[PDB]
Each structure stands twice: as structure tokens, then as C-alpha cells.
Write a structure and sequence with these properties.
This is part of a larger assembly, with 7 protein chains of 7 kinds. Chain A is an alpha+beta fold and 242 residues long. Chain A has 6 helices and 9 strands. Chain A is globular, with a radius of gyration of 18 Å. Classes of the chains: A alpha+beta (242), B alpha+beta (226), C alpha+beta (196), D alpha+beta (249), E alpha+beta (241), F mainly alpha (217), G alpha+beta (244). Strand 12 of chain B pairs parallel with strand 10 of chain D, so a sheet runs across the interface.
Chain lengths: 242, 226, 196, 249, 241, 217, 244
């Protein structure tokens, strides 16, 4: 009863199949997004289940367009398919209007899409929360997208097992800078609170990945963090938690 | 044929002739060339006749729907827009030379539409083969802000000139006056300028002046009981 | 038919005739070709009447939806839709469209779209049939960044020569001024530019 | 995919197609509406109910026009009727304004609309609509007619009938008031009097919708000067006029 | 049984599955109020920002369907954006094929049919959002139409939405009984905004801020939104009355 | 159309502005005028169908009557106003006849005059007219017998309606009769069946369709 | 799901029998009686309505009788609503035969077609069958007058006289005992009325509850004239046979 499809509805006003899908991402990886003034900084915890893996080869950060970063948590194949559709959307906009799609526009379109699969018993919903953002001529934007098809403006967002650990620190970070803060400094921050959300993942070990889209350094394109900047961040977070 | 439409401040008048030619053969002495997309939206048609008649049937249904959905007076430009799109994808293989007239609560309107899907506006327009002859007479007498009576005349006279310098224009001149905020007044046979002259003797003959081979009776009145 | 648009200091002015021929008969001589697809981006029709009007309607339909979801279009954005429909009917439809608009993302812009469909940014644009005879005058007499009055008179003078040398361009000259001062429709009657 | 092409109408193990019986129940949960056939007109009447006191019953239409000379009125579900009246208009236009040209006979049109009801009890992904329609009309061939369309997809001509929650009481009311010869005026009085007993709110003429398919009226066509052609035999009575009628019961 | 799980009638003739759709718009705790002014239509609605970490400027319940028609939504946000999109496509559609902007009346009717179609299938979930469309039309004047999940719609003098909307309704009804007309008289739309706020504060028992409100105004030929600053201007004018 | 309107107006201004004795002459010509319309003496004074006039004439003839002033002329008028109702030969006579008697009830006349006029109506209602009508006019005569303080004449009339009109029964018109019946019994000073019939009236009014007057009673 | 809301309605049962067809026969026994008799001068179709109300107009009700073509008519017993669709399919199939062969359709062909549609509903699509039984009066030039009865399963069986609808048992036996093969249209007209008065769902058979129709070869040259009688002529013939 009311737990056999996504087009039953309960007298409670609740859809449980859809609610249940948020729990899928709750057993996913920890991922954070800091909304900056110049851009956005994403970071994602990559769990290490053995040492046979090859670190920074197993991508969860896919770029959509030349300027929208997307990183997702939850059931992995599902999230890769959600990004798959969104790349088609990027090309279509470019084809008709000859300009890269805006950040709010992309957010809109994905919401429609995730809506569609909770309206029919003939397609299965997704099991991912995605975090994406960027820079356009309306400014920097940050969005988190539920598998219900919900998004909002976000000063800071997180998801995964340690979404609680992450969000608690982001509140204090708006206390430190009530004027928002720079993307370049937020790289070091981004590492910091994944280490803090690895205290819920403290019977495992992790690989840290960081990606950024900022207008003040990378000219408003979405790129990866690597090399010297990366290891500075790794060192910072270590000493703090030690 | 000839169709004139004269827009003016207070309304619009559309007038047409009743001579139907196919080729240089005159199909009809009398025929109504004023057609109804909608009860407020009248047009008349020139060029080939079947194509005008067909497309106003087709768009009359679509507009009639729309008028029921809103439950109030249909806008003129709705008809305009739909005709244009329809004709455009045939690329003008359907010959419709319509003068589309109508009133609605966003003013008086007057449009013309071509086979290809061209549309013009004006405070007066003329179409058909006799358009040219009509033009001249109009442009002398026409003023800004005509009276309804004055406009009546000027329209009828312009068609009259069609009768005299064009061979698609003839028998009767009908007028329809559409005024904002009232009912459209259909003035059929407003001016009758030509009668068949009298003949000099009647053409009767007694019977069987034509030979007859055989005959039979043929009943359609029903079917039969016993 | 001739259409042009010319950039100036504070925005952009669009200029058109109002005569439309088919063959030797003028169908109407007071039909406005200046068309509004956004409050702030207007465009100019020339060539075959039906083709341009059809495309203009389609673009308005698409731009409406753009506004209601994503924010307003830019002059660029708008040009592309005209362009791409002309690219899909490049063997069928012959259309001259100039898309000009005043933004606050980009101040005044002129884009033009040929029959086959390409977009081209220019500091001035001309298109049609009659505007190719005024082409040389255009470039020799053009100035970058003129006064409002200087732009109005330049367009008036260009189209006077156009009407001179082309019988399909005639009637009134119609202009739209796009700015951050308002939107100003202007009209010049024939005696007024025959003096000059 | 598409795996809903199994009918959602079925039989019961005790006979009797169960789905259209449920759909017929929704009419007894619906509003009351009635039609009295006269011998020189037809009258149809319904009550306006809204879910708000700020709602406009001036943009609320429960009596709607199909063609000038034919009107319809429902009892049952609002939403169901809202789409169904559009489909009635659509088939009437595509099959009798593009093929036969003129406005159809009443008898014809009633049959055609019943076919759409039938085709919502055949296919999957569709269950039938749960309203009953009274289609009153006049054609110059079969005279005045009043018909009732079922949620089963059948039709019946009636002498006078009601549909809605008070239908059973109403046909008992009509038994003694009805006569084979009626005037149109007298019909109005009978119709509204029966519907006053099938409304348990207050009974106004601002909240009661009245329409006659009675006398022609030419000036509602849109033109005048050819009398061989008329305007609508349908004529909706404005509110103030209905108030005059409340006094005439 | 299983006439409550898919949209098939019961032995009462009732669709329980559809009724449940109404029961979900109370779960976001959003109220809206919309009244017809003298030359405007104002809708004021709650804006919940429960955290800092939500950026308040983005949290929008107001979607512009047309240039002239605003839409305010009460209920779950996925279904809101879904409904907005359908409506936007249809408005554009009609402008393209009929040569003017889609009437508010006809748009309401359109969404009503689509709602019925979502309850006509037996694997399609009704869109649970309640939609308010506000406009100033040039043929119907100031207008409010509220469509609902079942696919019923009706015009409106004024309307409210939310879990607490009976109270709001009570206030508005009494006002139009003293005034004896169906729209508020004033002559500056600004003061109709101010009046609407006063009634809302009375109804829900709470004074609102510039980020507890989000305000939309349709005047003639236009719809726009007030920024959070403009709203603070109004709350000073509460003092000034 | 203009002539019956003008004559009505003329009467009215004289009443309130000039003298009530000049209106008297116009009243008498007005009643005769009304007979011309009623017999179609030009086409009903509009030419060819009775069109508008059909309704108007009996409507302005009752507007005259209530205006008005208790006169012997007024009393005398009314006995022959029920022949004027048959003169038309129309089917709309049901609706107006009720208001006709009622206006005469309103004006003080005394024991005889109100009852005699109402009984006379019942005689024409069994001639050819509806079964609904007779019962209405019996209800009215019944009320009159009670007003004039006659309770044997009221009781006897009432019994034949209620007992035999279960074979001609759909009407909400028996609610009226039960309530009246209790009133009669009260003033015979027999409260046993006054109470029994009141309950029956209450239960028969427990279904919801009833006027405000009806509940007040 | 989508297989979650289907219990499988149009499979066979363990006696080889379709659930929906078996339920259908019961629902047609709810509906009014219709009897067909074949005389050696004609065919009589006679039908009693399943609805008769307070103020139902039955004076023009042509709601059981339908002309499929000018030599083939049907009597209907079952859902009137269900029957509609097949009635108009039949009109189309008949006119098609005339259009392409320039000849009137045989009775055999037309019935066999409609039966195929019924069979087709349980064969594919998950769809239910229309709960209808038809009695066909038809003339052809190859078997003369043909009488048929068809059932919701999609099978046809010939008869000399047959009954459908309510109270088929009682009617069938009485018809067997009283029918002779040398009866006329006159005799058959009276026999049908007597059988319908033993199966009337009221306690009396009335002229406005009767639809009565014939196909007679008394029309000249041996042509068949179909007649659906007026309500005054049914009343006319019902007093003649001495029911009323």
C-alpha cells in the first residue's frame, strides 16, 4: 500500500518512494559546495575500499558545458546518466542561441527532467543529489538538486553521510565572513570540512578531490585543482585535524 | 474579381461583386462572394474560387472553436495569423487572394493576404484582377476619417469602376458595413447596375417539337407496401 | 525595399521604408516593417514579405519563452534564432533581416542575416535590394560614435538616395530609436527630405 | 512505455459493467439540472455552486453552447464536463461543418457524442466520464427534441427529466405538472419550481442559471437584413430577468 | 481496496487518489494572498528561509508565465517548476498561432484540462501544486484564477492559499461586504500592497519582514516583482497610516 | 404600446400630485382599454400577434387595483375581474390570478367581500384549469374563514383537501394546510389534534425547501 | 508498476472459457427481450426496451432498431451503449461492399465480420468485449432470407426462430411449440407479440414499450421493404392481436 509505485499518494500528503530516494544519497559520498563571491568551490570525498584503486582516476566530477561544474553523490550509475542528459541540453542551447547555457537555465532544465520520472510507473527515479554551479553574467550561482526535483539558492550546501558535519562548519564560516569570501581562499576551506566530514567515515580512508569555477583565477571556466595548490590544501586540512 | 476594403476611424467596409467567372465563361450571374470565417469576420475572395472557398471553410471551423472557448467576440488577427501559416507551407500553390476585414475591441482592422502568405495592412486595400481600376477612383476621393455613409458610397463606386474596366467584375455590388460595438450590417444588392435588356419575343414551342424516343416512369418517392 | 541600421553613441537607430512591391503594382505603401520581438530589440524586414514575417513570428514565440524562464535575451541571442531558421530554409526562403537592439549588457548592436543564414556583426548594416546602391555612400560618410541628431540625419540621407534610385523603396521613412532615454518613433514625410 | 491499453472498464462477477455504474453514482453526487420539453421550445436550468464566496459565478459556465440552435447542460463532475464539451464541439465541426456544412440535426449530434462516451469504456489508460448531459435542441426536421446522454454511452429522448442528486424526486414532481401541450413561459415556471426543491442553499436568480432553446432571436446572430437566415434559438437569460421569473413561479 | 491507489472510481464515485493531491500543499507552510486592486492585482506570499545556508534571493515561489501574467504557487517545489514549464510553453504557443498573448482565462482552462488528463491515466501522479494566476487583462480587467489538482478552476474576486488560509479568507470576505464591490478602491497600487499586508498580518497573527514576504504586482500590460528593499519601504508605511 | 403606458402614467400623477377624484375617470377608461387588449380589438392594440400586450394588460389592471383606495367602485370592480380572466383564453392565467385575489384580501372590505371573491375563483379553477391552482385557492379561502373567526367553515373545507389529495400528490402545498389546520383546532379549543397535526407540519417541513414565511408560521 | 494493476482479465479459465465472455452473457440477460422469427414471406424483429420510465419518451425512440442497410436491420438485446460502435461499423462494411462490387452485402458476410471484431477483443490488446447480442434480419440472393444470432464471444448460429435478452428459456420453448414453417408475416406478427407478453418485465406489454419492425416481400416485384412502424401503428396492431 502506497509503497508500490510513485503515482500512489498517501492521505498523509506524502510520497514515500520519492522520499526514500533521498536516503540513497544519504549512503553516498560526502560532497560540499561553497558559494563564493567570484565563483564556487566543490569538493568531494572519494572513499578508498582497497589500495588496488588508482586515485584521481574514478571521476565523479564531470564538466557540463565549458563552465558548469557537476559533482554528484548517491547511486553512481544513475548520476552519470543524469549528467549524460545534461550535456545534450548544453549543446542544444548553444546550437539555437549560439551562446553557452546560463547557470540558472541549466538548473531549471534538470529540475524538469527529475520531475518526469516520479510521474510515471514506467520509468524509475534517480538516486543522486547533484551539486553544480558556476559563473555567468548574473553572477556566481550554487545549486543542489534532490532526487525529488527540488532546488534552491544555497549559500553553502552539502550531502552525503557527513552532510551534518559539513553544514555545521559552513554556518560558522558565514560568521567568519558575513560578506562572503574569495574563491581562492575557499579551496583551503573545502578540504577542511571534508576532513571534518570524514569523522563520520572514520572506519574507512579517503582521497580528497577539489574542483573550482572562479572568475578571479580561471577566467570563469570550470577546471580541476591539482599539483602544488592541491597539496597545499591537503597539508592544511591534515594539520588542523591532528 | 474585385474586392475593396476601406478602413476608417469608426469601422470598416468590405464590398464585392457577384459575377462568378470561370475563365472567360461566366459561371454565375449571381453568387455571394462575401464569405464568413466568423459572424463578425467577413472576407471576400478572388483569384481562383475553389481555393478561397476551401480555406475559409477550413479556418472558419478553427476560429469558431476559438470563439466558443473564449465565449466572446473573435479577434480579426487570429484569422489572419492562421491563414498565413497555412498558406506558407504550400508556398502559395493554394491561390487565395483574400481581403480580410473585421472589427474587434482592439479597433478597426483591414488586412490583405496573398497566396504565398504575405500580409499587408492599410487604411485601404484592394485585391483581385480589378484591383487596379478600383485603386484610382478611391485615391482621389479618399480622406482620413470618413463617415460611414460616405464610405459606403466610395466603396460601391470603386467596384463600379471594376465593372467598367475589368472583366471579372460585374453584376451586383454588395456591401457589408462592420462598425465597432454593433452588429455587422449586410447590405445585399446595394447597387444593381445592370439588367438583362428585354428581348423582343418569347421562345415557346408546342410539344414534341423535340422528338422523343421512348419514356419510362421512375419513382423515388419511397418504397412500397404491397 | 531597403533597410538599414546604424549604431551611435547612446544606442542604435533602425531605419526602413514602408513601400512594399510585388511586381509593378505596389501592394501597400504604409505598411511598417519595423517589428517588435522584444521591448528593446526590434528588427527590420526586407525582401519577400511572407518569408520575413513568418520567421519573425517564430522568433517572437521563442523569445517570449526565453524571457519567462531564463531572463531577457541579448541582441546576440536574438540574432541566432533568425539565423538558424534561415539556415534550415536556405534553399527555399530568401529573407533579409537586420536584428538590432539596445542592451545594457552590450550597448547598441547590429547583426545582419543573409538569405542563407549567417550572422555578422557590423557597426552599420544595410540590406535589401535598394540599399546596395547606397552602399558606397554609407561607408564614405560614416562616422563612429555620432550624436543622436547626426544619426537621425544620416539615416534620412541614406534612404533619400535609396528612394532616389529604387522604385521599390518609397513612402515614408520610419525610424525607431533604442536608448536609455526611451524609444522614439520618428517619421519623415517625402517633402521633408526632398528639400534636401 | 505504454502498457496501459487494457480497458479499465470490466464486468462484475454478478453481471453489470461496474465502472459505468460507479460513474453513474458521481451524477448523484453532482448538482441538479433539469430539462422540460415544451411543444414550442425547450428549457434547461441548473444551479451554480462554488467552493468560495469570492468566486465569480459570472465566468462560470454550466450551460454551454454547442451550435446556435443546440444547448447542453450537465449533472456530475465539473472537470469531466469541461473537457467533454470541447470534444462535442470538435466532432460536430469536423464531421458536419467540413463535410455536411450546416448545423447538424439534434438527433445526429446526440448519437455522435455518445460514441465518445463509448470510446472511453474501450481502451486502456482511460476510464469513462462521470456526468450525464441533457442536450436540448431544435432541428427543422424532427422538431423540438430533448435528449439525455448516459455515462454508459447511450441516449434517450425524454418528455421531461432531471439529472443530479435530486433526480428521483424531480421526476415525481414533473409527473403532475406535466401535460402534452405546454407553453414556453409555463415551462420556465415548472422548471425553476422543480429545481427549487433540489437545491438546499438559497435560491436566487443570480445563482441560478437559466437558458431557453425557445424563440429565435435574430440580433444575436451578428447580422440582420436576411430573414430566411436566423440567429440563435438558444438564448441565455440574464440575471435580472431571472429575478422577474422567481416571482412568476 | 485498489481504487484509492490509481485513479478509478469507488462505489461512491469518488477518486481518493486525487483528493490526496490537495493534502500535500500544507507541507511547505507557504501562504499566499491575492487581491484585485483598482488598477492592479497584488499577490503577497510567504518566503521560508530556515537557514543562513540558504540564500534568500533565490527562494522564489513566483514564476512569470507571460509578460503580463504572474503565477504564485503553493505546495511542493518540484511540481511547481513542472507546472510552470507546461504553462509557459502553452502561453508562447497561443501567441504564435493566434497573434496575441494568451488570455489568463484561457490559460487557467488549459491547465485544468491537463490536470484532468493526469488523473485520467492510471499510472500518472496528479501535480499536487495549487496554482494562482494573477493578471490585469484588457478584456477581463483585473483577474485572479486559481487552478487546482483535480482540474477544476473558477474565477476569483480574491483568494488565499496555505494551511492557514481560512483565517485569511474570513478577513477578505468581510472587507468586501463593507465595501460592496469586488475590488479594493484606492488609487496608488502601492497602498493596495500596504493594505494586503495588513490583512495578512491579522490573519496569520505574525508580522512579516522583507525576507518573509515576496511581492508580485501586475499593472496594465505588465508584471514585475518587488525587491526586498521595496518591501521594507512598505513596512514603514504601515506606520504612516 | 404607447397608449396603455401613457394612460397608466396619467392616472398615477393625478393621484399623488393633483387630486384623487380626477384619477377616477382615467381608471374607468383604463379598465375598458384593458378589455380591448384582452379581446384583441386591433391585434391587442399592437397589431397582429398579441405580442407584448398579452402580459401587460392584466398586469397593469392589478397595478391599478392595489394602488389605490377602498372604494365601493373597487369592491364592484373585482366580481367581474374574474370574467376578464377567462376572456383571454390563454394558459398564463394561473400565475396572475393568485395575486389578483390577494390584492383584494389586503384592502379592508369586511366579512363577506373577500371570501365571495375567492370562492368564485375556485369555480373557474375546476372548469378546465390546473389541479395545482384549485388547491392554492382553497388554501386561500381556508385562511379567510379563520380570519373572520369561523372555525366550522374552515375545518370542513380543509378536510376534503388533505384526505383525498394523496392520489394527486407531489406538492409542497400540504405543509401549508397542516399548519393552518393546527390553528383552526386551537381556536375550537381542542389541543389534542392541534398538537398531532403540528408535529406533522414540522416533520413535513423538516425537508429543506421551505420559505421564510413558512417557518415563521 | 503496470503489471501491478492488472490481474489478467482476458485469459482462458481452466475450462477453456473466457472470464469476460461468461460474465457478458449474464449482463445481456439483464437487458430486455428481443425476438426474431422468420416467415416464408419475411422476417419479424420485435424488441422490448430495457428502460421504461416516468416520462421517458418512447414514441420516437429508435434505440433498439437500426437499419444497417436497406435490406438488413437488427434488433438489439444487451447494452444499447455497447451496441452503438458495432452498429456503425456494420453500416460502413455494408456500404463498402456496395461501393466496390455494385451489389448489396450478403447477410453471412456482414455478421461474420462483426463476430470477428468481438473475437479480436479477447485475442489482442487486453480489451474487453462488448456485452451485446444481436438478432439479424437480412435478405440476400443466395440463401434468401437469413436469420442469425450472435453472442459476445464472436460466433454465429442460424435459427428459424430465436430469442435473446431477458427470459430466453421461457420464450424459446413457447416458440418451438407454436411455430410452423408455413407461417406468414401475419401469423408471425401475432406470434411474436404473444411471446413477448410472457416475458414482459412489467405486468403488461404496452404499445410504447414495443418496438416492432418487419421486412416484407409483399412490396412489388419481390423487393423487400423494411418498415419500422409508427407508434400509432404499433398501438394499432397490438389491439388487433388482443393483448390490450
Amino acid at each position: 500500500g502506497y509503497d508500490l509505485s510513485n503515482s500512489v499518494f498517501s492521505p498523509d500528503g506524502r510520497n514515500f518512494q520519492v522520499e526514500y530516494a533521498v536516503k540513497a544519497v544519504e549512503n553516498g559520498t560526502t560532497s560540499i559546495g561553497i558559494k563564493c563571491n567570484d565563483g564556487v568551490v566543490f569538493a568531494v570525498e572519494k572513499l578508498i575500499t582497497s589500495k588496488l584503486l588508482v586515485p584521481q582516476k574514478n571521476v565523479k566530477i564531470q564538466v557540463v558545458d565549458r563552465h558548469i561544474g557537476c559533482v554528484y553523490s548517491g547511486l553512481i550509475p544513475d548520476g552519470r546518466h543524469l549528467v549524460n542528459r545534461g550535456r545534450e541540453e548544453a549543446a542544444s542551447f548553444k546550437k539555437l542561441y549560439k551562446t553557452p547555457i546560463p547557470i540558472p537555465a541549466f538548473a531549471d532544465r534538470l529540475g524538469q527532467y527529475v520531475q518526469a520520472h516520479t510521474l510515471y510507473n514506467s520509468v524509475r527515479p534517480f538516486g543522486v543529489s547533484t551539486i553544480f554551479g558556476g559563473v555567468d553574467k548574473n553572477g556566481a550561482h550554487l545549486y543542489m538538486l534532490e532526487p525529488s526535483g527540488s532546488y534552491w539558492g544555497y549559500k553553502g550546501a552539502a550531502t552525503g553521510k557527513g552532510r551534518q558535519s559539513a553544514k555545521a562548519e559552513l554556518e560558522k564560516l558565514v560568521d567568519h565572513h558575513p560578506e562572503g569570501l574569495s574563491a581562492r581562499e575557499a579551496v583551503k576551506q573545502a578540504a577542511k570540512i571534508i576532513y571534518l566530514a570524514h569523522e563520520d567515515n572514520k572506519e574507512k580512508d579517503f582521497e580528497l578531490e577539489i574542483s573550482w569555477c572562479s572568475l578571479s583565477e580561471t577566467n570563469g571556466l570550470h577546471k580541476f585543482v591539482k599539483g602544488d595548490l592541491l597539496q597545499e590544501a591537503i597539508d592544511f586540512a591534515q594539520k588542523e585535524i591532528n | 474579381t474585385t474586392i475593396v476594403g476601406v478602413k476608417f476611424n469608426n469601422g470598416v467596409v468590405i464590398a464585392a461583386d457577384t459575377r462568378s467567372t470561370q475563365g472567360p465563361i461566366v459561371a454565375d450571374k449571381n453568387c455571394a462572394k462575401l464569405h464568413r470565417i466568423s459572424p463578425k469576420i467577413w472576407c471576400a475572395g478572388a483569384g481562383t474560387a475553389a481555393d478561397t472557398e476551401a480555406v475559409t471553410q477550413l479556418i472558419g471551423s478553427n476560429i469558431e472553436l476559438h470563439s466558443l472557448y473564449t465565449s466572446r467576440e473573435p479577434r480579426v488577427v487570429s484569422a489572419l495569423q492562421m491563414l498565413k501559416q497555412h498558406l506558407f507551407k504550400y508556398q502559395g500553390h493554394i491561390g487565395a487572394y483574400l481581403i480580410v476585414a473585421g472589427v474587434d475591441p482592439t479597433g478597426s482592422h483591414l488586412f490583405s493576404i496573398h497566396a504565398h502568405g504575405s500580409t499587408d495592412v492599410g487604411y485601404y486595400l484592394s485585391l483581385g484582377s480589378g484591383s487596379l481600376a478600383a485603386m484610382a477612383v478611391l485615391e482621389s476621393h479618399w480622406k482620413q476619417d470618413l463617415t460611414k455613409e460616405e464610405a459606403i458610397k466610395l466603396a460601391s463606386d470603386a467596384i463600379q469602376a471594376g465593372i467598367w474596366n475589368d472583366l471579372g467584375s460585374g453584376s451586383n455590388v454588395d456591401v457589408c458595413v462592420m462598425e465597432i460595438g454593433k452588429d455587422a450590417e449586410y447590405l445585399r444588392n446595394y447597387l444593381t447596375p445592370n439588367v438583362r435588356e428585354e428581348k423582343q419575343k418569347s421562345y415557346k414551342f408546342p410539344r414534341g417539337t423535340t422528338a422523343v424516343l421512348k419514356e419510362s416512369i421512375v419513382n423515388i418517392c419511397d418504397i412500397q407496401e404491397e | 525595399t531597403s533597410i538599414m541600421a546604424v549604431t551611435f553613441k547612446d544606442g542604435v537607430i533602425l531605419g526602413a521604408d514602408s513601400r512594399t512591391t510585388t511586381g509593378a503594382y505596389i501592394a501597400n505603401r504604409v505598411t511598417d516593417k519595423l517589428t517588435r520581438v522584444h521591448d528593446k530589440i526590434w528588427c527590420c524586414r526586407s525582401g519577400s514579405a511572407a518569408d520575413t514575417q513568418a520567421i519573425a513570428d517564430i522568433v517572437q514565440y521563442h523569445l517570449e519563452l526565453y524571457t519567462s524562464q531564463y531572463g531577457t535575451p541579448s541582441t546576440e541571442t536574438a540574432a541566432s534564432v533568425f539565423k538558424e531558421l534561415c539556415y534550415e530554409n536556405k534553399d527555399n526562403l530568401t529573407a533579409g533581416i537586420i536584428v538590432a537592439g539596445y542592451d545594457d549588457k552590450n550597448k547598441g548592436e547590429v547583426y545582419t542575416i543573409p538569405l542563407g543564414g549567417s550572422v555578422h556583426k557590423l557597426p552599420y548594416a544595410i540590406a535589401g535590394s535598394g540599399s546596395t546602391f547606397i552602399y558606397g555612400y554609407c561607408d564614405k560618410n560614416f562616422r563612429e560614435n555620432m550624436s543622436k541628431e547626426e544619426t537621425v540625419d544620416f539615416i534620412k540621407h541614406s534612404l533619400s538616395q535609396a528612394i532616389k534610385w529604387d522604385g521599390s523603396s518609397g513612402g515614408v521613412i520610419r525610424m525607431v530609436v533604442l536608448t536609455a532615454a526611451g524609444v522614439e518613433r520618428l517619421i519623415f514625410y517625402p517633402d521633408e527630405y526632398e528639400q534636401l | 512505455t505504454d502498457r496501459y491499453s487494457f480497458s479499465l472498464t470490466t464486468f462484475s462477477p454478478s453481471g453489470k459493467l461496474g465502472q459505468i455504474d460507479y460513474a453513474l453514482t458521481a451524477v448523484k453526487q453532482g448538482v441538479t439540472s433539469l430539462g422540460i420539453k415544451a411543444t414550442n421550445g425547450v428549457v434547461i436550468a441548473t444551479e451554480k455552486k462554488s467552493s468560495s464566496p469570492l468566486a465569480m459565478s459570472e465566468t462560470l459556465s454550466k450551460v454551454s453552447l454547442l451550435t446556435p440552435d443546440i444547448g447542453a447542460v450537465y449533472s456530475g463532475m465539473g472537470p469531466d464536463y469541461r473537457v467533454l464539451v470541447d470534444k462535442s464541439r470538435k466532432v460536430a465541426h469536423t464531421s458536419y461543418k467540413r463535410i455536411y456544412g450546416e448545423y447538424p440535426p439534434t438527433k445526429l449530434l446526440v448519437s455522435e457524442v455518445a460514441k465518445i462516451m463509448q470510446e472511453a469504456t474501450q481502451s486502456g489508460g482511460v476510464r469513462p466520464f462521470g456526468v450525464s448531459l441533457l442536450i436540448a435542441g431544435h432541428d427543422e426536421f424532427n422538431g423540438f427534441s430533448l435528449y439525455q446522454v448516459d455515462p454508459s454511452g447511450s441516449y434517450f429522448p425524454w418528455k421531461a427529466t432531471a439529472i443530479g442528486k435530486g433526480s428521483v424526486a424531480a421526476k415525481t414532481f414533473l409527473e403532475k405538472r406535466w401535460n402534452d401541450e405546454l407553453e414556453l413561459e409555463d415551462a420556465i415556471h415548472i422548471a425553476l419550481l422543480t429545481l427549487k426543491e433540489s437545491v438546499e442553499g438559497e435560491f436566487n436568480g443570480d445563482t441560478i442559471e437559466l437558458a431557453i432553446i425557445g424563440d429565435e432571436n435574430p440580433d444575436l446572430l451578428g447580422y440582420t437584413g436576411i430573414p430566411t437566415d436566423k440567429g440563435p434559438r438558444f438564448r441565455k437569460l440574464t440575471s435580472q430577468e431571472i429575478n422577474d421569473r422567481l416571482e412568476a413561479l | 481496496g485498489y481504487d484509492r491507489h490509481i485513479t478509478i472510481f469507488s462505489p461512491e464515485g469518488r477518486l481518493y487518489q486525487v483528493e490526496y493531491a490537495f493534502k500535500a500543499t500544507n507541507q511547505t507552510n507557504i501562504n499566499s494572498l491575492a487581491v484585485r486592486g483598482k488598477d492592479c492585482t497584488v499577490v503577497i506570499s510567504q518566503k521560508k528561509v530556515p537557514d543562513k545556508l540558504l540564500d534568500p534571493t533565490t527562494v522564489s515561489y513566483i514564476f512569470c508565465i507571460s509578460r503580463t501574467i504572474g503565477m504564485v504557487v503553493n505546495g511542493p517545489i518540484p511540481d511547481a517548476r513542472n507546472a510552470a514549464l507546461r504553462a509557459k510553453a502553452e502561453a508562447a504557443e497561443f501567441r504564435y498561432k493566434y497573434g496575441y498573448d494568451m488570455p489568463c482565462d484561457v490559460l487557467a482552462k488549459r491547465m485544468a484540462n491537463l490536470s484532468q488528463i493526469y488523473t485520467q491515466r492510471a499510472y500518472m501522479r496528479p501535480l499536487g501544486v495549487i496554482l494562482t494566476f494573477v493578471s490585469v487583462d484588457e478584456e477581463l480587467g483585473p483577474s485572479i484564477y486559481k487552478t487546482d489538482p483535480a482540474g477544476y478552476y473558477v474565477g476569483y474576486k480574491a483568494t488565499a492559499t496555505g494551511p492557514k488560509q481560512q483565517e485569511i479568507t474570513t478577513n477578505l470576505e468581510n472587507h468586501f461586504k463593507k465595501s460592496k464591490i469586488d475590488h479594493i478602491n484606492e488609487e496608488s497600487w502601492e497602498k493596495v500592497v500596504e493594505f494586503a499586508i495588513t490583512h495578512m498580518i491579522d490573519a496569520l497573527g505574525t508580522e512579516f519582514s522583507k525576507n518573509d514576504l515576496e511581492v508580485g504586482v501586475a499593472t496594465k500590460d505588465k508584471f514585475f516583482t518587488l525587491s526586498a528593499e521595496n518591501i521594507e519601504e512598505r513596512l514603514v508605511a504601515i506606520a504612516e497610516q | 404600446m404607447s397608449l396603455p403606458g401613457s394612460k397608466l402614467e396619467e392616472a398615477r400623477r393625478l393621484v399623488n400630485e393633483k387630486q384623487y377624484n380626477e384619477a377616477e375617470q382615467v381608471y374607468l377608461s383604463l379598465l375598458d382599454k384593458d378589455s380591448s387588449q384582452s379581446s384583441a380589438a386591433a391585434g391587442a392594440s399592437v397589431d397582429d400577434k398579441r405580442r407584448n400586450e398579452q402580459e401587460t394588460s392584466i398586469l397593469e389592471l392589478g397595478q391599478l387595483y392595489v394602488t389605490m383606495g377602498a372604494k365601493d367602485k373597487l369592491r364592484e370592480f373585482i366580481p367581474h375581474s374574474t370574467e376578464y380572466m377567462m376572456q383571454f383564453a390563454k394558459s398564463k392565467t394561473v400565475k396572475v390570478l393568485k395575486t389578483l385575489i390577494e390584492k383584494f384580501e389586503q384592502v379592508p372590505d369586511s366579512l363577506d367581500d373577500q371570501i365571495f371573491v375567492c370562492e368564485k375563483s375556485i369555480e373557474f379553477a375546476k372548469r378546465e384549469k390546473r389541479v395545482f391552482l384549485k388547491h392554492s385557492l382553497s388554501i386561500k379561502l381556508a385562511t379567510l374563514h379563520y380570519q373572520k373567526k369561523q372555525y366550522k367553515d374552515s375545518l370542513a373545507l380543509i378536510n376534503d383537501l388533505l384526505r383525498e389529495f394523496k392520489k394527486l400528490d407531489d406538492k409542497p402545498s400540504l405543509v401549508d394546510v397542516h399548519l393552518l389546520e393546527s390553528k383552526v383546532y386551537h381556536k375550537l379549543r381542542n389541543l389534542a389534534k392541534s398538537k398531532a397535526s403540528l408535529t406533522a407540519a414540522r416533520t413535513a417541513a423538516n425537508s429543506i425547501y421551505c420559505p421564510t414565511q413558512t417557518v415563521a408560521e | 508498476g503496470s503489471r501491478r494493476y492488472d490481474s489478467r482479465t482476458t485469459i482462458f479459465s481452466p475450462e477453456g472459457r473466457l472470464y469476460q465472455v461468461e460474465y457478458a452473457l449474464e449482463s445481456i440477460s439483464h437487458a430486455g427481450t428481443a425476438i426474431g422469427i422468420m416467415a416464408s414471406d419475411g422476417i419479424v424483429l420485435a424488441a422490448e426496451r430495457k428502460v421504461t420510465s416516468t416520462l421517458l419518451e418512447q414514441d420516437t425512440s429508435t434505440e433498439k432498431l437500426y437499419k444497417l442497410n436497406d435490406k438488413i436491420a437488427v434488433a438489439v438485446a444487451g447494452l444499447t451503449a455497447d451496441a452503438e460502435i458495432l452498429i456503425n461499423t456494420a453500416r460502413i462494411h455494408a456500404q463498402n461492399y456496395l461501393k466496390t462490387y455494385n451489389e448489396d452485402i450478403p447477410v453471412e458476410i456482414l455478421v461474420r465480420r462483426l463476430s470477428d471484431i468481438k473475437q479480436g477483443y479477447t485475442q489482442h490488446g487486453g480489451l474487453r468485449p462488448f456485452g451485446v447480442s444481436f438478432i439479424y434480419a437480412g435478405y440476400d440472393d443466395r440463401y434468401g432470407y437469413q436469420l442469425y444470432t450472435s453472442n459476445p464471444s464472436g460466433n454465429y448460429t442460424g435459427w428459424k426462430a430465436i430469442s435473446v435478452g431477458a427470459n430466453t428459456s421461457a420464450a424459446q420453448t413457447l416458440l418451438q411449440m407454436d411455430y410452423k414453417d408455413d407461417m406468414k408475416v401475419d401469423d408471425a406478427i401475432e406470434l411474436a407479440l404473444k411471446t413477448l407478453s410472457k416475458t414482459t418485465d412489467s405486468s403488461a406489454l404496452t404499445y410504447d414499450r414495443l418496438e416492432f419492425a418487419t421486412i416484407r416481400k409483399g412490396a412489388n416485384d419481390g423487393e423487400v421493404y423494411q418498415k419500422i412502424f409508427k407508434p400509432q401503428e404499433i398501438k394499432d396492431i397490438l389491439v388487433k392481436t388482443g393483448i390490450t
